[PDB]
Write a protein that binds this ligand. Structure first.
Ligand SMILES: Nc1nc2c(ncn2[C@@H]2O[C@H](COP(=O)(O)O)[C@@H](O)[C@H]2O)c(=O)[nH]1
Ligand SMILES: Nc1nc2c(ncn2[C@@H]2O[C@H](COP(=O)(O)O)[C@@H](O)[C@H]2O)c(=O)[nH]1
Lengths: 226, 226
């Protein structure tokens, strides 16, 4: 769905029209999805930067391309969950739609060989990530959560869960990386509880592009120009 | 492999000759195993009690039966790992036998429906277990680890990993429960690195009873009387 090096300080992140699911056993191509996800990442990164979150966003380079800061990437995917959906149904005997009493943070080791298994703080330590780093990472993820869920709730969108990735900059500061989009979040309409995210593609729920268009219109206030 | 109520304060824990593996898809019966595991649990509980670990062990009731304290059981299995073996090979790209730089503690939610999935502190909280409780539980597991690994290393046995369970007594103190035996630990001979534990049954490595007998002889100093 997405890195083209420039130099020491920066690289290009390009969003593609490809989508994969289920460990890459399901593939399809959606015209315009690159564009939507690039635009929506920019909007989210900017909102978070205003709230004092250090992100890798530097600028736009036209098309579906962002200029981003180069980082020593942690091999983690950091998942924040507000509402029970997806893999959480297999870890806790709770139904889809269940509202958690407080946010859940899950750590996944980015490892294709092992299919991205969940880890805790001890596994992370063996992977070279101190407890203090983990604490800072979860603290940021949790703050990101509050900002994004408030912003979206005030637009008729429930932030069900989402995935973040992080890296360290040259000062040793922890920096939010990768993307933030309907590909990497669960977004539900506040009224109907309908999916406006990758679950439309994952579980064949309708038209992916239309659901992404609705999110873009309902966030930005104007329909997608492309 | 094992509860017969007495009253409010206590119950009977009986160790049986049955063994199961792989989610109960593998079954077999081993004459004498109940007896060995009961005796070895007693020895371990006593050693830990001397070192100031609160356990549910009250007394022996002859045969393969222990008198134990009744508790509000946490629905957890708490795993401590010193050497890479078993499921850890699927979570970290490390070989069997790899010596961890420090102990790993893993939490599993005891749930047959969900096949005992791993959890973190956030899942535990949703299950009703405060962060403070979790911290006390891991602190005890880690202390138990030091005591058991020292004691066994001074007998030519490597403590690879093991599983603990816990409950709360009426004072709200956290109490070590279930069993401690070759069923619930990985034990390797310090020289040959051979298994003297349930892995003999799990992966058809030889004679289970003989491996358990060796552990009993090499711990107690005398061969099993039965
Ligand atoms: N695009 C993408 N999203 C992910 C991945 N892993 C987790 N997520 C996001 O994180 C949340 C939880 O995922 P789950 O564990 O339920 O599959 C969902 O919003 C999901 O979209 C991934 O590998 N790719
Ligand atoms: N008897 C028993 N032992 C377990 C269970 N779950 C974990 N253990 C113990 O905890 C350690 C780690 O298990 P693993 O996750 O590698 O299967 C091993 O020593 C194993 O014997 C269980 O359900 N039953």
């Amino acid at each position: 769905a997405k890195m083209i090096p420039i130099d020491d300080d920066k690289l290009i992140m390009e969003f593609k029209d490809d989508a994969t699911a289920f460990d890459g056993t399901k593939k399809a191509r959606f015209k315009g999805k690159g564009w939507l996800n690039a635009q929506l990442s920019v909007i989210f990164f900017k909102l978070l930067e205003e709230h004092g979150i250090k992100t890798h966003f530097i600028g736009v380079a036209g098309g579906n391309r962002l200029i981003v800061e180069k980082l020593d990437m942690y091999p983690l995917e950091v998942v924040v969950r507000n509402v029970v959906a997806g893999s959480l149904k297999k870890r806790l005997p709770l139904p889809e739609g269940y509202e958690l009493p407080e946010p859940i943070v899950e750590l996944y080791y980015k490892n294709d060989e092992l299919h991205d298994p969940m880890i805790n703080y001890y596994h992370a330590k063996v992977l070279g990530i101190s407890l203090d780093e983990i604490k800072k990472i979860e603290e940021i993820a949790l703050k990101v959560n509050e900002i994004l869920k408030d912003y979206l709730a005030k637009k008729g969108i429930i932030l069900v869960d989402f995935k973040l990735e992080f890296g360290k900059d040259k000062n040793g500061d922890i920096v939010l990386a990768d993307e933030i989009s309907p590909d990497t979040c669960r977004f539900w309409d506040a009224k109907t509880k309908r999916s406006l995210d990758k679950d439309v593609f994952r579980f064949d729920k309708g038209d992916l592009i239309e659901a992404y268009k609705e999110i873009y219109e309902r966030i930005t206030g104007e329909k997608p120009e492309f």
